[PDB]
Paper text:
To understand the interaction between CtNDT and ribonucleosides, we cocrystallized the variant CtNDTY7F, which possesses higher catalytic efficiency with ribonucleoside substrates than CtNDTWT with the nucleoside analogue Immucillin-H (ImmH). This analogue is a purine nucleoside phosphorylase inhibitor, rationally designed to mimic the transition state of the reaction catalyzed by that enzyme. Importantly, for CtNDT it is a nonhydrolyzable substrate analogue containing hydroxyl groups on positions 2′ and 3′. Figure a compares the structures of CtNDTWT and CtNDTY7F, depicting key residues participating in the reaction and substrate selection. A flexible loop that acts as a “lid” and could potentially allow bulkier substrates to be used was observed in an “open” or “closed” conformation. Figure S3e depicts differences in the normalized B-factors for this flexible loop and ligands, as only 2 molecules of ImmH were placed in the CtNDTY7F tetramer, with less defined electron density in the nucleobase moiety of ImmH, while two other monomers remained unoccupied. No major differences are present in the protein backbone, but the wild-type enzyme binds ImmH in a distorted conformation in relation to the ribose ring, bringing the 2′-OH farther from D62 and closer to Y7, likely to avoid clashes, which does not occur in the CtNDTY7F mutant. Following our interaction map with ImmH, a ribonucleoside analogue, we designed mutants targeting residues surrounding the 2′-OH group, aimed at further tailoring substrate selection toward modified sugars.
Guided by the structure of the enzyme from the thermophilic organism Chroococcidiopsis thermalis PCC 7203 (CtNDT) bound to the ribonucleoside analogue Immucillin-H, we designed mutants of CtNDT and the psychrotolerant Bacillus psychrosaccharolyticus (BpNDT) to improve catalytic efficiency with 3′-deoxynucleosides and ribonucleosides, while maintaining nucleobase promiscuity to generate over 100 distinct nucleoside products. CtNDT has a preference for purine-based 2′-deoxynucleosides, while BpNDT prefers pyrimidine-based 2′-deoxynucleosides. Importantly, wild type CtNDT can utilize ribonucleoside and 3′-deoxynucleoside substrates, albeit with lower efficiency, demonstrating less strict selection of 2′-deoxynucleosides, and a possible strategy to produce 3′-deoxynucleosides. , As proof of concept, we determined cordycepin (3′-deoxyadenosine), a natural product currently employed to treat various types of cancers, can be used as a substrate by CtNDT. We have previously shown that this tyrosine residue in CtNDT (Y7) does not directly interact with the 2′-OH group, and instead positions the catalytic E88 for reaction.
Author numbering:
A (entry chain A), B (entry chain C), C (entry chain B): 1 to 154
D (entry chain D): 4 to 154
The structure:
């Protein structure tokens, strides 16, 4: 028995209130599906401005977590999405990880008409049916008709 | 020198004035080193708001050029850096491509004291000496003492 | 039972989870100081992409509330802070309103070294002791040693 | 007669020397005395802690003493200092002119290409006459900046 591993990428650890109120409900949503959630702010233990001697080790721990996970769950909220989440999203695409995006932000920050965001954030997703991997609410995370559930059971 | 391939990832194509006045001087500086420059805005015909039936091909073209290149020259100006540049930069790190960063913007948009930006942008760079890969002037691109020159002669 | 009015500018209404979990604790902390809180998302019914005919109404509602308040409490989280918050902040500075800033985000997104953000966000604040108007935690709003309590006590 | 040119173009050394002068020339060609803050305040590098407040009050007084603002609202999202100086110009009833040649959309609505609060000082109808999408439109006679000088 080995549960699937999801790297939960988000900018929510940068804010004290967001870290304590927004991440735990998302973590619970994924693990009600049996997932082992790798949350980088708690794992790599970054709670304030990372010191000069600590910044490389945090980057390497996030680099290694992306290499050793099965899928990424990228909170792509904000205008624009957080640049650290994007670096790790591109690493997950190049390494053929399962890709899932989350944005409950109704603002559109896009360079095209087909996607709500920059089109490169969707390069790792199919041309038709990418919306199945695009979650717009925390309640939607556990939908048995969406891609994350079908990736665990399929 | 070897005629290496550089993928020039930048947001300068989104603005009419920047595509005309800012991108050509950077392309000329890279070509002055004997580099084959893959500039995606002209190489993939990203002229304006990408149509819906065209966005998936623009994404996959950027993705293929990152896979088939030798290195990436990421213009990481802005607060924060462009999310499309950040995705393409994440792909290059995971594919073990050469990494070179460009920022002549003097604003600091960082989460740490070591690096001037989010530390994940430097994950593919060495712990010591990453400054040699970090360019803060167009004129600094053709310096022998910087990593892009040494990369060509090795 | 005279009661000072504070306009609470934040980007938190753009995300479903942020509007539900982050704003109520902040409104609570202000109301516990006897403050009267005008919250634009609650007052304007802006719950998704505003219609074309509805967008100008929202614009004039955010505008009149700033003009008729006694002070603004600006949530200036994010890299960079929300541009609508920044417009409403400059209005309050221009109208000699009381200014209070909130940021529990530890990222530095600044053009200088004195302030943790762009220097113009502190133009309406004193050159010395501006930190007294700068809140970095929800638990800090109650502090009688900080400028919000003092502004309420004359 | 006086336009304050709010832009983030002074933050990049390449952008300050290549992008701002062409915009300054067009505004002056219409007959406007341009107030460019990065040059007017002769400061362009991570402002010394002892200088940052002075730079803030200098531009704060420039928006108070100008006749209108020309705000380069390019980028996703637009620069925060530009937006602060914009909201001041709106509260002080100054003339409002916006410039965005960036073809990316970053709005919270459908009518306006950006956050609807950048257009609070513009009319509900015909706000697009104040919205410039290219440098070769600054000198357009059918646009609000020329009509603003002709009474
Ligand atoms: O200071 C930090 N501490 C921990 N993780 C990160 C990261 C990585 N990038 C993402 C946020 O930028 C986050 O999900 C994490 O994997 C950037 N900066 C920090
Ligand atoms: O180095 C500077 N010199 C002059 N003004 C500014 C500012 C002020 N804030 C705004 C930031 O874009 C800018 O347009 C100007 O009004 C920031 N940095 C500088």
């Amino acid at each position: 028995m080995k549960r699937k591993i999801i790297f939960l990428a988000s900018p929510y650890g940068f804010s004290q209130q967001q870290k304590t109120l927004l991440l735990p409900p998302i973590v619970r949503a994924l693990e009600a599906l049996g997932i082992e959630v790798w949350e980088p702010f708690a794992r790599n233990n970054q709670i304030d401005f990372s010191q000069a001697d600590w910044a490389y080790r945090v980057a390497q721990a996030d680099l290694q977590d992306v290499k050793n996970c099965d899928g990424i769950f990228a909170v792509v909220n904000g205008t624009p999405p957080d640049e650290g989440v994007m670096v790790e999203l591109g690493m997950a695409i190049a390494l053929n990880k399962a890709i899932f995006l989350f944005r409950d932000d109704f603002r559109r920050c896009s360079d095209n008409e087909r996607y709500p965001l920059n089109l490169m954030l969707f390069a790792g997703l199919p041309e038709i049916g990418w919306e199945n991997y695009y979650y717009t609410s925390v309640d939607e995370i556990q939908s048995h008709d969406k891609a994350l559930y079908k990736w665990l059971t399929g």
